[PDB]
């Protein structure tokens, strides 16, 4: 060529111009540069803090984030190198760009593979897991994995080709050998098929010991016990519980506590002359034996005022019935005098003591399993469609329609690298603190 065989030179069927050309250009460039910076931000907090670069779990995030960065950098580079300067790509300069993107996804799948192995060791060798998967072990596994990932990108650059082999070309990518894609597609397809199976088994094994779901049922008229429950809700949410907070007026007692292994009942006391539970709680209290409390871990809280004869008599009545039902009361009830906002240190302190009802390792294994499946599903949603396009290319021919959706499916591949740093921020509670360490 000619017009040039250039990276990001797609068929570009244009419904509207030049607003599309102008607006999509700025939009796509801004999206790309945002990714490079936000994945550069993830790379920073990890290398910056020692409490994380010694963890084997952050050798997994850092690997993903530098894979996301390798691709987002190639995106912005090739976008500004062609849509702004209109420069031409030779054979090697083209394959290097494409190989970089290919390497970014390879290492991403390779990282999810190593994570599955770590979880398999945690499942099969829970006792000695800490001494098996160590910082020097994790570095070697990831360094090896990247060299295997890089090698595949360079293989096309180096040997496999249309030009060098005079082989059948790919209808999507210039210079690319069709039989190389079969090898590439098959390798990642097998790995992903295993990772999908593994991540399901990992998550299933993580629920065999414990689920990490807390239930909070509160009865409140003024809102003091609602504020108390919402405060307890966020402390348990940070500590790795899937917290479900419900007003007593909206629940049915039958089988209420099923599926939860921590249940926190809160109720205010309204003894005008006697002792009475908050009215929305009474229906639950009267049918409490239907909830499934026997053997379950529970604890009570409630707002009251000491100038009444029976200070927080409601939590007394609930705890006594929970004892009579064979519930496992984890600790003594929280009794808040006066305004709960003026006693927040106790509410948070109590929630911290209740937190230990389920061991840290069980909750941590569940959020690790939950986090991995989210990374995986996002990766299948974004990169999946593009892979399906490449499958259409190798076996049979393309279609005019598949060449058009490819322009938008390839943009899905980019926003996978943008939401992964967002996923790390929402689930890795330690990364948030390391971030705030640098203000
Ligand atoms: C095309 C295209 C494009 C592209 O040209 N997008 N256009 C779409 C239309 C408007 C402007 C951008 N962008 N990307 C892209 C996707 C994810 C990352 Cl991390 C990096 C990049 Cl460069 C691609 C892309 C490039 C290569 C692959 C691949 C592969 C395995 C062989 C998949 C997508
Ligand atoms: C009519 C009335 C009766 C009350 N009786 C008691 C009581 O017997 N024992 C107690 O500890 N507090 C009693 N209180 C105080 C409430 O429990 C207190 O106002 C509580 O903070 C309100 O809870 P809530 O806003 O979450 O519904 C009573 C308050 C009122 C207005
Ligand atoms: C393709 C890779 C397949 C398998 C490697 C996974 C095996 C890695 C190590 C197995 C875990 C194990 O049992 O480790 C033994 C440990 O050294 C006791 O001290
Ligand atoms: C050898 C395997 C080495 C490291 C794999 C660690 C996988 C743990 C996933 C951590 C995800 C997280 O931190 O939330
Ligand atoms: C993308 C291919 C993934 C292959 C990575 C293999 C990781 C190496 C396996 C075990 C290393 C243990 C030391």
121 lines ligand 3 (CB under 6 A): yes
Ligand 2 mutation pick, 269, 335, 340, max ligand atoms within 8 A of CB: 269
302 lines ligand 1 (CB under 6 A): no
CATH of 1-211+359-439, one of 3.40.605.10, 3.30.365.10, 1.20.1070.10, 3.10.20.30: 1.20.1070.10
- Please count the CA atoms within 13 angstroms of the CA of 100 that sit on its side-chain side: 18
Q: What does the alpha-carbon distance between residue 103 and residue 73 come to, in Å, rounded to a whole number?
A: 12
Beta bridge partners of 262: 214
325 with 289: CB under 8 angstroms?
A: yes
Question: Which of 307, 321, 326 has its CA nearest to residue 267?
Answer: 321
Q: What does the alpha-carbon distance between residue 433 and residue 439 come to, in Å, rounded to a whole number?
A: 9
Burial status of residue 330 (CB atoms within 10 A of its CB: 0-12, 13-18, 19 or more):
middle
Question: Which of 192, 108, 111, 95 has its CA nearest to residue 153?
Answer: 95
342 lines ligand 2 (CB under 6 A): no
Question: Which of 99, 48, 109 has its CA nearest to residue 74?
Answer: 99
251 with 288: CB under 8 angstroms?
A: no
Quote the ligand 1 centre to 413 CA distance (angstroms).
7
Beta bridge partners of 301: 266, 334
Q: Which residues of the chain come before a gap where C and the next N are over 2.5 Å apart?
A: none
Q: How many helices (H) and strands (E) does the chain have?
A: 15, 6
Q: What does the alpha-carbon distance between residue 383 and residue 416 come to, in Å, rounded to a whole number?
A: 8
Q: What does the alpha-carbon distance between residue 277 and residue 43 come to, in Å, rounded to a whole number?
A: 53
End-to-end CA distance of the chain: 52
Q: What does the alpha-carbon distance between residue 123 and residue 118 come to, in Å, rounded to a whole number?
A: 9
Quote the ligand 4 centre to 25 CA distance (angstroms).
37
- Residue 216, φ and ψ in degrees, nearest 5: -130, 120
User: What is the stated resolution of the deposited model, in angstroms?
Assistant: 2.8
Residues 6+ apart with CB under 8 A from 304: 268, 269, 311, 312, 313, 314, 335, 336, 337
Question: Which of 423, 416, 430, 421 has its CA nearest to residue 109?
Answer: 416
Question: Which of 139, 30, 110, 109 has its CA nearest to residue 76?
Answer: 30
Q: What does the alpha-carbon distance between residue 101 and residue 299 come to, in Å, rounded to a whole number?
A: 52
Residues 6+ apart with CB under 8 A from 352: 235
40 with 67: CB under 8 angstroms?
A: no
Question: Which of 273, 301, 277 has its CA nearest to residue 287?
Answer: 277
Residues 6+ apart with CB under 8 A from 274: none
Alpha-carbon distances of 232 from 127, 130, 221, rounded to whole Å? 32, 31, 18
Which experiment gave this structure?
X-ray
Burial status of residue 316 (CB atoms within 10 A of its CB: 0-12, 13-18, 19 or more):
middle
| Residue 149 Cα to chain centre, angstroms | 23
Q: DSSP 3-state assignment of 3?
A: coil
213 with 325: CB under 8 angstroms?
A: no
Q: What does the alpha-carbon distance between residue 274 and residue 269 come to, in Å, rounded to a whole number?
A: 10
Residues 6+ apart with CB under 8 A from 213: 241, 242, 243, 244, 259, 260, 261, 262
Q: What does the alpha-carbon distance between residue 72 and residue 40 come to, in Å, rounded to a whole number?
A: 10
The CATH superfamily label for domain 212-358 reads Flavodoxin domain (3.40.50.360)
Q: What does the alpha-carbon distance between residue 299 and residue 334 come to, in Å, rounded to a whole number?
A: 8
Residues 6+ apart with CB under 8 A from 435: 45, 425
Assess whether the previous peptide bond of 229 is cis (omega < 30° from 0): no
182 lines ligand 1 (CB under 6 A): no
Q: Where in the chain is the domain with CATH 3.40.50.360?
A: 212-358
Burial status of residue 14 (CB atoms within 10 A of its CB: 0-12, 13-18, 19 or more):
exposed
148 lines ligand 3 (CB under 6 A): no
How many other CB atoms are there within 10 angstroms of residue 93's CB atom?
16
Question: Which of 213, 234, 230 has its CA nearest to residue 266?
Answer: 230
DSSP-H helix ranges across 159-213: 178-209
Report the phi/psi class of residue 276: left, alpha or beta, with left for phi > 0 and alpha for psi in -120 to 50: beta
- Please count the CA atoms within 13 angstroms of the CA of 215 that sit on its side-chain side: 22
Q: What does the alpha-carbon distance between residue 418 and residue 430 come to, in Å, rounded to a whole number?
A: 20
Q: Considering only CA atoms, which residue is closest to atom 9 of ligand 4?
A: 57
Helix (H) or strand (E) run with residue 242 in it: strand 242-247
- Please count the CA atoms within 13 angstroms of the CA of 186 that sit on its side-chain side: 8
Q: What does the alpha-carbon distance between residue 61 and residue 57 come to, in Å, rounded to a whole number?
A: 7
Most distant CA atoms of the chain, gap in Å: 96
239 with 355: CB under 8 angstroms?
A: yes
Q: Where in the chain is the domain with CATH 1.20.1070.10?
A: 1-211+359-439
Q: What does the alpha-carbon distance between residue 297 and residue 354 come to, in Å, rounded to a whole number?
A: 10
Q: What does the alpha-carbon distance between residue 294 and residue 255 come to, in Å, rounded to a whole number?
A: 11
280 with 251: CB under 8 angstroms?
A: no
Residues 6+ apart with CB under 8 A from 285: 267, 277, 317, 318, 321
């Amino acid at each position: 060529g000619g017009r040039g065989e250039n990276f990001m030179d797609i068929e570009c069927f244009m419904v509207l111009n030049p607003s599309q050309q102008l607006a999509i250009a700025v939009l796509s460039l801004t999206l790309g540069t945002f990714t490079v910076l936000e994945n550069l931000l993830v790379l920073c907090v990890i290398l910056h803090s020692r409490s994380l670069r010694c963890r084997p779990s952050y050798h997994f995030i850092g690997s993903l984030a530098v894979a996301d960065l390798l691709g987002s950098v190639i995106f912005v580079y090739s976008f500004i190198d062609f849509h702004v300067f209109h420069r031409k790509d030779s054979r090697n300069v083209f394959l290097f760009k494409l190989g970089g993107v290919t390497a970014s996804f390879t290492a991403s799948v390779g990282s999810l593979f190593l994570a599955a192995i770590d979880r398999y060791i945690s499942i099969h060798r829970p006792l000695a897991y800490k001494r098996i998967v160590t910082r020097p072990k994790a570095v070697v596994a990831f360094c090896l994995m990247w060299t295997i990932a890089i090698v595949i990108a360079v293989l096309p650059l180096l040997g496999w080709n249309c030009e060098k082999l005079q082989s059948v070309c790919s209808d999507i990518f210039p210079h690319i050998d069709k039989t190389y894609l079969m090898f590439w597609i098959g390798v990642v397809s097998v790995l992903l098929l295993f990772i999908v199976y593994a991540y399901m088994y990992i998550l299933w094994k993580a629920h065999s010991h414990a689920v990490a779901k807390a239930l909070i049922v509160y009865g409140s008229t003024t809102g003091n016990t609602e504020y108390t429950a919402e405060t307890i809700a966020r402390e348990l949410a940070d500590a790795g519980y899937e917290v479900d907070s419900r007003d007593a007026a909206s629940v049915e007692a039958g089988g209420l506590f099923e599926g939860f292994d921590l249940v926190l009942l809160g109720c205010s006391t309204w003894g005008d002359d006697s002792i009475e539970l908050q009215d929305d709680f009474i229906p639950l209290f009267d049918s409490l034996e239907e909830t499934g409390a026997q053997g379950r871990k529970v604890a009570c809280f409630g707002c009251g005022d000491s100038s009444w004869e029976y200070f927080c008599g409601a939590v007394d009545a609930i705890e006594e019935k929970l004892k009579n039902l064979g519930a496992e009361i984890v600790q003594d009830g929280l009794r808040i005098d006066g305004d709960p906002r003026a006693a927040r240190d106790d509410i948070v302190g109590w929630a911290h003591d209740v937190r230990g009802a389920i061991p840290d390792q069980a909750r941590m294994d569940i959020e690790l399993a939950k986090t991995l499946v989210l990374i995986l599903v996002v990766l299948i949603i974004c990169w999946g469609p593009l892979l399906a396009i490449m499958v259409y290319d190798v076996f049979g021919k393309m279609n005019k329609l598949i060449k058009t959706v490819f322009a938008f499916c390839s943009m899905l591949c980019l926003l996978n690298s943008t939401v992964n740093p967002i996923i790390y921020a929402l689930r890795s509670k330690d990364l948030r603190h390391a971030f705030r360490s640098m203000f």
